[PDB]
Design a protein around this nucleic acid. Structure first.
Ligand SMILES: [Mg+2]
Ligand SMILES: [Zn+2]
Ligand SMILES: [Zn+2]
Lengths: 90, 106, 1269
DNA sequence: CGCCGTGTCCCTATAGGTTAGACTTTAAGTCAATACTCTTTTTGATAAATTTTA
DNA sequence: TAAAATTTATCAAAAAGAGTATTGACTTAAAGTCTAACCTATAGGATACTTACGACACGGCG
């Protein structure tokens, strides 16, 4: 009679898969620089979260430029067009 | 009632392709059995290891980096020697020596 | 394995060596630590160590260096935990390197002691050797001990001579003291006794002193005799002797104590030589020695053939079960929850650690041996708690739960969750009757179809753009937002839902219905499946399941859909037959009332007939107007109904096709309206729809027409039945329960007789029991007379008697008790109370009479509960026995077969039909042909033999047909198809995948419950049980052995019967036949000089199937068992076709017993399958010919199950410990081919849609349609 | 070979280890001034198709 | 029956932020490290006490 409060919720796992897919599509709407900065900044490609200096190094620019592209991209995604699609997962 | 073994669960695809490359290291046990221990590439490989058998096993690669022996557990001799002096046990030894050899000569 | 598939094809048990153990383990536990007290993380090298047993967190090592998937398969170089998924802790095992050997508790203490046979020692003797209480010599040479002996008897003579130097020193010293007694006694003036009291004291001193010397000399003589007779492989006590023997004879032998010495014993045990000696003994020995060799011979060859080297009994390194199977769950609040395997493992580990410590210190033998004993004790406790001593308990003195108690008894896996499993996608609810659904449809409350199909509706209302994604759909559905329902109808249509009831007594307890969303919260069930489900509406609940895969929904839609499963599996009578209310409606619809409104009278002269009606349409119009009653006799002119056979042959002869033809008929309007329900091809009926008539109609209509027509016709009958049951005016009012005017006179007439009987008892003319019997008979006569007067009093339109004589429900006795007399009421013990009750329930009983009625009814209720409980046991056993009778081949092509009685001859001479033909002859396939008076063939070989052909046979005038049966099917594993005949459920031939064994078991053990007892032959369900158990009958009765006349004699207070042979030489004498019995009556009573049969029954009663087997072969016992069981089932009026009982009986008579071994492999008294026996004889006729002599045996169902080959099912049955241990000893290999072994390991069962003839069919578009596509 | 009974299912002293607590570095983050060129927006500012008027 | 008039086309210019940086500056997050300090594992203590809490099968007997 002991519910294991750690089991796979079934709907949670499939929901996470759907979130992965939808987020991937939305990020693919971003420009190449934008998609790259987002994926690296939030570790969507290897699970390692790269920080601003690493991202500026692998793109060969200054970290201030990386942060500006970051802010611009975030604001673009906050736009309801590509936002309301992902609201429900949260 | 609701309980759960103290722990956690993850929901991520088990990608079998893009991982961190491993590096199998051999660790010979005292009896000599070999037990593979996969290690990552950029990873300081230890000379010794606790193997799958459960006894300490050293690298098949030649390292032999000092046994690092420890002080012996206090012995009965240690617990006796403090309270009593060597010369003091000497007279008792001679008493038993004469006792048993008197039995012998008899 | 580590990686698994569904191709599992052999589960092979076998003892495991420690060499296999330290290669299983992924580490080694060494510390008795469970989880840290403060941080609540597992310990290193403990019982939960992540390095040994794998991470507790998905893709995280202990110290947290690697914490993601990209690092997988690697081991972190500092905390040592291999980073991987966190369910390996379900599967990785450990081991414990013991410091000293230890032995099992299963192959030693469990009766019989397998080790005890193995090493040739008794169990109690070994229980002193492996618990450190007796030494053992492991080997010896003694060649030079021969010469050393001579030296030591010389030294023994020297020692005993020194002893005698001491002894004559005693003699001399006490002699001097005794002459001092002389010199101080005689010299002095002491009393003559006193002066010699010292004399006696000294002589007594020498007596006790020579006792001292003599006793120590016997001690030395004993030790010398022991050394001379020192010999190996024995049990020795007196450790002191052992010490003296060793330290004087330290060479010449080695001897040790405990589990290491026995390890050596097994090391120095040669199974080969011992086995040859055992063969020699069993071949040449006799009596007890031969048998003791046999049982030992069994286990020794078992080890020899397994090649398993019994070392598995001495358990070195001990394996540790994975942590997750023994969880440490933390119930919220901090209260931890162990699993009690943690505690036992901790005990063993603590004791092993302490033993290692003591060994290092070098403690005296007392402490080390005690600790080894405690290790052994705790290992034994862990592998089984409660064996070899009192249970190891804990808090609340509750016994713990050793691994065995997880795999034994009723709470082990092998008698529990491997039987039943909670399932997702399920629900239940209370049921209500829906007289609007079709037979296939069913109701389903919306609030229960939105939480069963929730994934389907989620997907669907995502696809229709009502939700942005899945999460929105889940929340919306959970909030029952307006448009979920509209989608729910779309996801429901054409998707079955199995509707099960509990108890699932028989096969129709689960059926598949197409759901139909209905409001409320009660599952609306179609009323015509109540008979199958045994579901009244007093608050029954049913469980809705949900098939998911394409195969599952196809299964429901095709196999289990209600419309297809109309007929019953047992006797083929319909179970969608309109019952109860509908039957009353149809009766009232089709009954005929003379003198009703608007009859046909041919009276003329003044006016015409005024009875004819041009069409049933005009008849209905005249019925709506108050002219025509529905039940008046009229002459209609029909054009859409087929006339009966005689009228068709009259008006049309051969080919009257109805849709156009016209014909008149004198019937009632009700019967026309009724026959409009039945299909067009069916002839006109024109009867009064008694329930049996409707049973016959639906049986014929199901035997000749497709199934969909049957379903639609049954639905139409249901509708008409309800509609005309409302109009029938069947009510109950106390003005409508008429009492018989002539009751008081009847009661006075029988009261006078009761009074007279009581007077003859009061005057002492008869004893106490006889007057009770007389009163019982008188009041039975009174009950019969009151019932008869009541029956002749009532009219026919009385609703109570209308309900009864319709066959809707209720027998006539209940009417007799409602009005008239209750009659005799039983004792709590079973006898009849002689009062008796004389008031109807309409008149209202008095106090005492109600008390007696309570006696009866309460006992009845308790008995019904227990009877249901027992029916369950019988069904379980029958299913176990007949789990492996599944139809394999289309045709065994055999020619043998039983004969059928089939309308025995009349004395005057006719063909009177045998009443029980529908259970014994129908649905069978002939092996021979029907020929008569050297005429033509009538029915050829292999025909279904339904009703029309039976009518043809009875018309042609034959009485016996030789028909096939599942008793003589010659297929190896299970029956063929043509032997099983028509499947009683389909109406067609049985398929090639059916599990007819399970259908037979269910159909036999289902109609129990309602199986009463009688007023010393057992005559109910226990009788059936003792028949199938093949017990010796409670009322054993003698059976003849050979023909001839009888030697009848009435001896002292009981009988004496003997058979006069006609060539049987020795006369069989039956002496001790009691006076309480009765002689058999047949045709007249058994008279002296009467000619008896070979196996004629002497005493009316019952006989033991073993004896009739031994006398009259297998055929006779099969017929006897079938007849005897069907006698019970006919007595209760339950229709069971004989082929089910024949399946079970065929499962009884498989094996044969070995009376002569021949020279090949077969122990006498052992029971082996017939096919194996014949194959072995076929093999051994070559390579030198010798037959093993076999005799047929009849064994009960339980014993038949006990001899199943598969250890898995065998253990799942009962006695798990014994089954598993013996299977292990013999390295048993199950093939996973039953329908019970394949329901455990989850793969596909070899029956129905699981066998490879159906599971591997290939489906492809046909080339023509594919090209058109 | 049969017949039966009964067995069994209180404290101190060392030492290590732990964390906590906080200072001087990093190393990663965020703000703001200028700056440079450039597709595109955005509002502005003149030309041309559809409707008013005598 | 033709203008005087009311709205679609095109850029001029500013700009406007994008396409894009830089640089410097300030900040903090951490974090590495030094120190502090506080559990926790570990061991050692001296009159004398001395053994607790219904059936199935095998072995004996006849
Ligand atoms: Mg009920
Ligand atoms: Zn680690
Ligand atoms: Zn057959």
């Amino acid at each position: 009679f002991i519910e294991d409060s750690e089991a796979v919720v079934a709907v949670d796992a499939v929901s996470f898969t759907l979130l992965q897919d939808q987020l991937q599509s939305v990020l693919d709407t971003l420009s190449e620089r934008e998609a790259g900065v987002v994926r690296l900044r939030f570790g969507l490609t290897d699970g390692q979260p790269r920080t601003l200096d690493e991202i500026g190094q692998v793109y060969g620019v200054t970290r201030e430029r990386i942060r500006q592209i970051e802010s611009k991209t975030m604001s673009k995604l906050r736009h309801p067009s590509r936002s309301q699609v992902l609201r429900d997962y949260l | 009632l609701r309980g759960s073994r103290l722990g956690a669960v993850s929901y991520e695809t088990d990608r079998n392709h893009d991982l961190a490359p491993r590096q199998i290291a051999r660790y010979r046990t005292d009896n000599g059995e070999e037990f593979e221990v996969p290690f990552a590439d950029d990873a300081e490989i230890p000379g010794t290891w606790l193997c799958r058998n459960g006894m300490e096993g050293t690298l098949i690669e030649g390292d032999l980096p000092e046994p690092k022996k420890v002080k012996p557990p206090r012995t009965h001799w240690d617990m006796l020697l403090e309270r009593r002096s060597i010369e003091e046990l000497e007279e008792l030894l001679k008493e038993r020596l004469e006792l048993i050899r008197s039995r012998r000569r008899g | 394995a580590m990686l698994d598939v569904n191709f599992f094809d052999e589960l092979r048990i076998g003892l495991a060596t420690a060499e296999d153990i330290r290669q299983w383990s992924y580490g080694e536990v060494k510390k008795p630590e469970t989880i840290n007290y403060r941080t609540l993380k597992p310990e290193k090298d403990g019982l939960f160590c992540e390095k040994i047993f794998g991470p507790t967190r998905d893709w995280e090592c202990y110290c947290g260096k690697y914490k993601r998937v990209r690092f997988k398969g690697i081991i972190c170089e500092r905390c040592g935990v291999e980073v991987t998924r966190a369910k390996v802790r379900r599967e990785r095992m450990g081991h414990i390197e013991l410091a000293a050997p230890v032995t099992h508790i299963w192959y030693f203490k469990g009766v019989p002691s397998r080790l005890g046979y193995l090493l040739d020692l008794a169990p109690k003797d070994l229980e002193k050797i492996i618990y450190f209480a007796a030494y053992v010599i492991t080997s010896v040479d003694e060649e030079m001990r021969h010469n050393e002996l001579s030296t030591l008897e010389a030294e023994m003579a020297v020692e005993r001579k020194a002893v005698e130097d001491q002894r004559d020193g005693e003699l001399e010293a006490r002699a001097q003291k005794l002459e001092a007694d002389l010199a101080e006694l005689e010299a002095e003036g002491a009393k003559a006794d006193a002066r010699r009291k010292v004399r006696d004291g000294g002589e007594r001193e020498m007596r006790q002193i020579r006792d001292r010397a003599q006793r120590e000399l016997d001690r030395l003589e004993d030790i010398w005799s022991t050394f001379t007779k020192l010999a190996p492989k024995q049990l020795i006590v007196d450790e002191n002797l052992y010490r003296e023997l060793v330290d004087r004879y330290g060479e010449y032998f080695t001897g040790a104590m405990g589990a290491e010495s026995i390890q050596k014993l097994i090391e120095n045990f040669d199974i080969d030589a011992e086995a040859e000696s055992l063969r020699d003994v069993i071949r040449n020995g006799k009596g007890q020695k031969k048998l003791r060799a046999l049982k030992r011979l069994k286990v020794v060859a078992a080890f020899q053939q397994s090649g398993n080297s019994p070392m598995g009994m001495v358990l070195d390194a001990v394996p540790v079960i994975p942590p997750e199977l023994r969880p440490m769950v933390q119930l919220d609040g901090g209260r931890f929850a162990t699993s009690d395997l943690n505690d036992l493992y901790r005990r063993v580990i603590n004791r092993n650690n302490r033993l290692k410590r003591l060994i290092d210190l070098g403690a005296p033998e007392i402490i080390v041996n005690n600790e080894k004993r405690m290790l052994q004790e705790s290992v034994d406790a862990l592998f089984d708690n409660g064996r070899r001593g009192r249970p190891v308990t804990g808090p609340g003195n509750r016994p713990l739960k050793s691994l065995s108690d997880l795999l034994k008894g009723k709470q082990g896996r092998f008698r529990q969750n491997l039987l039943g499993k909670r399932v997702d996608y399920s629900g239940r609810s209370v049921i209500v009757v829906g007289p609007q659904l079709k037979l296939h449809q069913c109701g389903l409350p919306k609030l229960m179809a939105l939480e069963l199909f929730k994934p389907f509706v989620m997907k669907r209302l995502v696809d229709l753009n009502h939700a942005q994604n899945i999460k929105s759909a889940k929340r919306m559905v959970e909030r029952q937002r307006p448009q979920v329902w509209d989608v729910l109808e779309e996801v429901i249509a054409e998707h079955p839902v199995l509707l099960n009831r509990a108890p699932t007594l028989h096969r129709l307890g689960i059926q598949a219905f197409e759901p139909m969303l209905v409001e409320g919260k009660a599952i609306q069930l179609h009323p015509l499946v109540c008979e199958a489900f045994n579901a009244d509406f007093d608050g029954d609940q049913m469980a809705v399941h949900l098939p998911l895969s394409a195969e599952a929904q196809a299964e429901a839609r095709i196999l289990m859909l209600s419309s297809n499963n109309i007929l019953s599996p047992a006797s083929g009578r319909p179970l969608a037959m309109p019952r109860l209310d509908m039957v009353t409606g149809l009766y009232y619809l089709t009954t005929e009332v003379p003198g009703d409104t608007g009859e046909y009278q041919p009276a003329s002269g003044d006016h015409p007939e005024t009875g004819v009606y041009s069409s049933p349409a005009e008849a209905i119009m005249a019925a709506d107007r108050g002219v025509l009653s529905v039940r008046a006799k009229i002459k209609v002119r029909l054009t859409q109904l087929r006339p009966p056979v005689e009228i068709e042959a009259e008006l049309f002869g051969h080919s009257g096709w109805q849709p156009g033809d016209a014909w008149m008929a004198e019937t009632t309007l009700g019967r026309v309206m009724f026959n409009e329900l039945l299909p067009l091809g069916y002839p006109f009926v024109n009867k009064q729809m008694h329930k049996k008539v409707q049973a016959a109609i639906i049986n014929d209509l199901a035997e000749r027409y497709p199934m969909i027509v049957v379903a639609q016709t049954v639905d139409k009958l249901k509708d008409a039945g309800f509609y005309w049951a409302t109009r029938s005016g069947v009510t109950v009012s106390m003005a409508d329960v008429l009492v018989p005017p002539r009751k008081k006179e009847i009661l006075d007439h029988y009261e006078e007789r009761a009074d007279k009987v009581e007077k003859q008892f009061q005057r002492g003319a008869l004893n106490h029991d006889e007057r009770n019997e007389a009163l019982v008979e008188i009041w039975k006569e009174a009950t019969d007379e009151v019932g008869q007067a009541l029956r002749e009093h009532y009219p026919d339109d009385n609703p109570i008697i209308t309900i009864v004589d319709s066959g809707a429900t209720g027998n006539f006795t209940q009417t007799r008790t409602l009005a008239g007399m209750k009659g005799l009421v039983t004792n709590p013990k079973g006898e009849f109370i002689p009062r008796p009750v004389k008031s109807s329930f309409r008149e209202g009983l008095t106090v005492l009479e109600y008390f007696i009625n309570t006696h009866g009814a309460r006992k009845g209720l308790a008995d019904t509960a227990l009877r249901t409980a027992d029916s369950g046991y019988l069904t379980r056993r029958l299913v176990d026995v007949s789990q492996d009778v599944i139809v394999r081949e289309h045709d065994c092509q055999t020619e043998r077969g039983i004969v059928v009685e089939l309308a025995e001859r009349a004395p005057d001479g006719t063909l009177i039909r045998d009443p029980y033909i529908e259970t014994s002859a129908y649905a069978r396939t002939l092996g021979t042909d029907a020929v008569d008076e050297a005429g033509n063939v009538i029915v050829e070989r292999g025909q279904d033999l339904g009703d029309p052909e039976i009518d043809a046979l009875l018309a042609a005038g034959i009485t016996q047909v030789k028909v096939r049966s599942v008793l003589t099917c010659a297929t190896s594993t299970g029956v063929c198809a043509t032997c099983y005949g028509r499947s009683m459920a389909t109406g067609k031939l049985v398929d090639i995948g059916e599990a007819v064994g399970i259908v037979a078991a269910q159909s036999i053990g289902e109609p129990g419950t309602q199986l009463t007892m009688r007023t010393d032959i057992t005559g109910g369900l226990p009788r059936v049980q003792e028949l199938f158990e093949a017990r010796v009958p409670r009322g054993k009765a003698p059976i003849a052995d050979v023909t001839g006349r009888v030697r009848l004699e009435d001896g002292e207070r009981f009988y004496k019967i003997t058979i006069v042979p006609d060539d049987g030489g020795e006369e069989v004498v039956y002496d001790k036949i009691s006076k309480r019995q009765r002689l058999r009556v047949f045709k007249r009573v058994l008279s002296d000089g009467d000619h008896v049969e070979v196996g004629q029954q002497l005493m009316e009663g019952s006989a033991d199937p073993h004896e009739v087997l031994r006398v009259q072969g297998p055929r006779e016992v099969q017929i006897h068992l079938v007849r005897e069981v069907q006698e019970v089932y006919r007595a209760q009026g339950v229709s069971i076709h004989d082929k089910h009982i024949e399946v079970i009986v065929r499962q009884m008579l498989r094996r044969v017993t070995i009376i002569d071994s021949g020279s090949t492999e077969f122990l006498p008294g052992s029971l082996i399958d017939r096919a194996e026996f014949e194959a072995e004889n076929r093999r051994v006729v070559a390579e030198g010919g010798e037959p093993a002599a076999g005799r047929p045996v009849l064994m009960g169902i339980t014993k038949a199950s006990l001899a199943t080959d598969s250890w898995l099912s065998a253990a799942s049955f009962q006695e798990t410990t014994r089954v598993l241990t013996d299977a292990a000893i013999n390295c048993r290999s199950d093939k996973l081919n039953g329908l019970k072994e394949n329901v455990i390991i989850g793969k596909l069962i070899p029956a129905g849609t699981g066998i490879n003839r159906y599971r591997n069919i290939a489906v492809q578009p046909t080339e023509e349609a594919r090209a058109a596509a």
